[PDB]
Design an enzyme around this catalytic site. Sequence first.
Site, PDB file in Angstrom:
ATOM      1  CG  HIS A 115      -1.943  -1.002   1.245  1.00 21.48           C
ATOM      2  ND1 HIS A 115      -2.539  -1.418   2.422  1.00 21.48           N
ATOM      3  CD2 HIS A 115      -2.496  -1.733   0.252  1.00 21.48           C
ATOM      4  CE1 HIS A 115      -3.443  -2.342   2.132  1.00 21.48           C
ATOM      5  NE2 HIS A 115      -3.418  -2.569   0.834  1.00 21.48           N
ATOM      6  CB  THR A 194      -7.230  -2.127   5.564  1.00 20.94           C
ATOM      7  OG1 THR A 194      -5.808  -2.009   5.667  1.00 20.94           O
ATOM      8  CG2 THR A 194      -7.675  -1.852   4.154  1.00 20.94           C
TER       9      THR A 194
HETATM   10  C1  LIG Z   1      -5.381   9.588  11.759  1.00 24.43           C
HETATM   11  O1  LIG Z   1      -3.966   9.650  11.961  1.00 24.43           O
HETATM   12  C2  LIG Z   1      -3.189   8.510  11.979  1.00 24.43           C
HETATM   13  C3  LIG Z   1      -3.449   7.439  11.113  1.00 24.43           C
HETATM   14  C4  LIG Z   1      -2.660   6.282  11.147  1.00 24.43           C
HETATM   15  C5  LIG Z   1      -1.597   6.207  12.051  1.00 24.43           C
HETATM   16  C6  LIG Z   1      -1.345   7.281  12.905  1.00 24.43           C
HETATM   17  C7  LIG Z   1      -2.134   8.424  12.873  1.00 24.43           C
HETATM   18  O2  LIG Z   1      -1.850   9.453  13.726  1.00 24.43           O
HETATM   19  C8  LIG Z   1      -0.681   5.001  12.167  1.00 24.43           C
HETATM   20  C9  LIG Z   1      -1.196   3.789  11.396  1.00 24.43           C
HETATM   21  C10 LIG Z   1      -1.722   4.255  10.047  1.00 24.43           C
HETATM   22  C11 LIG Z   1      -2.953   5.159  10.213  1.00 24.43           C
HETATM   23  C12 LIG Z   1      -3.449   5.693   8.862  1.00 24.43           C
HETATM   24  C13 LIG Z   1      -3.677   4.599   7.809  1.00 24.43           C
HETATM   25  C14 LIG Z   1      -2.534   3.582   7.758  1.00 24.43           C
HETATM   26  C15 LIG Z   1      -1.345   4.179   6.992  1.00 24.43           C
HETATM   27  C16 LIG Z   1      -2.920   2.232   7.171  1.00 24.43           C
HETATM   28  O3  LIG Z   1      -2.905   2.220   5.748  1.00 24.43           O
HETATM   29  S1  LIG Z   1      -3.919   1.407   4.929  1.00 24.43           S
HETATM   30  N1  LIG Z   1      -3.858  -0.071   5.327  1.00 24.43           N
HETATM   31  O4  LIG Z   1      -3.602   1.579   3.503  1.00 24.43           O
HETATM   32  O5  LIG Z   1      -5.323   1.789   5.082  1.00 24.43           O
HETATM   33  C17 LIG Z   1      -1.926   1.217   7.763  1.00 24.43           C
HETATM   34  C18 LIG Z   1      -1.285   1.888   8.979  1.00 24.43           C
HETATM   35  C19 LIG Z   1      -2.180   3.106   9.157  1.00 24.43           C
HETATM   36 ZN   LIG Z   2      -2.292  -1.161   4.361  1.00 25.14          ZN
END
Ligand SMILES: COc1cc2c(cc1O)CC[C@@H]1[C@@H]2CC[C@]2(C)[C@@H](OS(N)(=O)=O)CC[C@@H]12
Ligand SMILES: [Zn+2]
EC number: 4.2.1.1
Length: 256
Positions: A115, A194
């Site tokens: 991703h 996700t």
């Molecule tokens: C709303 O702010 C935040 C979001 C996230 C994080 C920290 C934040 O402060 C850390 C984890 C982040 C997640 C965002 C989506 C991710 C990259 C996800 O991407 S994804 N699977 O393509 O939907 C996988 C890990 C996710």
């Molecule tokens: Zn992902």
Amino acid sequence: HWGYGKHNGPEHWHKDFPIAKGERQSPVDIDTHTAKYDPSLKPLSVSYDQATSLRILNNGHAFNVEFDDSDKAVLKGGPLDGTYRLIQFHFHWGSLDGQGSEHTVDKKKYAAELHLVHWNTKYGDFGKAVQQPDGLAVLGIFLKVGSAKPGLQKVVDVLDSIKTKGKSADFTNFDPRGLLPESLDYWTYPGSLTTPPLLECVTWIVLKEPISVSSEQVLKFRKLNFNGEGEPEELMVDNWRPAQPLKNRQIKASFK
Ligand SMILES: COc1cc2c(cc1O)CC[C@@H]1[C@@H]2CC[C@]2(C)[C@@H](OS(N)(=O)=O)CC[C@@H]12
Ligand SMILES: [Zn+2]
Ligand SMILES: COc1cc2c(cc1O)CC[C@@H]1[C@@H]2CC[C@]2(C)[C@@H](OS(N)(=O)=O)CC[C@@H]12
Ligand SMILES: [Zn+2]
């Protein structure tokens, strides 16, 4: 703390994040006998030449490569309006070659899924972008086991140095163009993050052509730990969310 196990995994997520049972949750199964070829769909515009990779990090869920999102790696075109800046990439993978992808194609599970996460620049910052239905564009790319992917080698070689949760390494001069297949044929549908917080802010773009990675390469993914250093050893495998119901969204294809 949320995770992928029996006690903290996808089945428990709806309790802290009720959106888990939403109308546009991701990933989904891409059923090809229902996917609509759309001749109006533009070719994707991936511009990664100026990407400025910074570091790689083990966050206890996966490892993620952060970019400088000013540096002007951008995703545009395809089905998208405006400019989406690359902010990071990560993978989801399995405890065996036979599973690990989040999206599925006619129920086929791939060994892994990459991703590439981008945000809409009219929103000023990633945080504001995720609060909007067109806030993000994630480019998903499947991984099958085959010949080695040279552009992946720097990623996998560094994993040894970020085995446990919170570990990072420097990751300058990484060209994400090397993670891309030949074809940019794609499917697209409105979806979600996700992982928690599972926000329904994502324009999903899933590539038709998987990249070929070697067994030696994918194996290295499976040597990571979910846990922190000096904690009970939890191997980082099967960090994928199962396919979610489409609930009558149209997955549009750019090819027949
Ligand atoms: C709303 O702010 C935040 C979001 C996230 C994080 C920290 C934040 O402060 C850390 C984890 C982040 C997640 C965002 C989506 C991710 C990259 C996800 O991407 S994804 N699977 O393509 O939907 C996988 C890990 C996710
Ligand atoms: Zn992902
Ligand atoms: C909640 O508000 C914001 C969050 C973020 C930013 C700006 C915000 O206004 C900038 C970068 C975002 C970062 C969130 C964690 C990300 C996705 C990281 O994902 S990660 N390492 O899996 O936790 C990589 C890039 C991070
Ligand atoms: Zn976490």
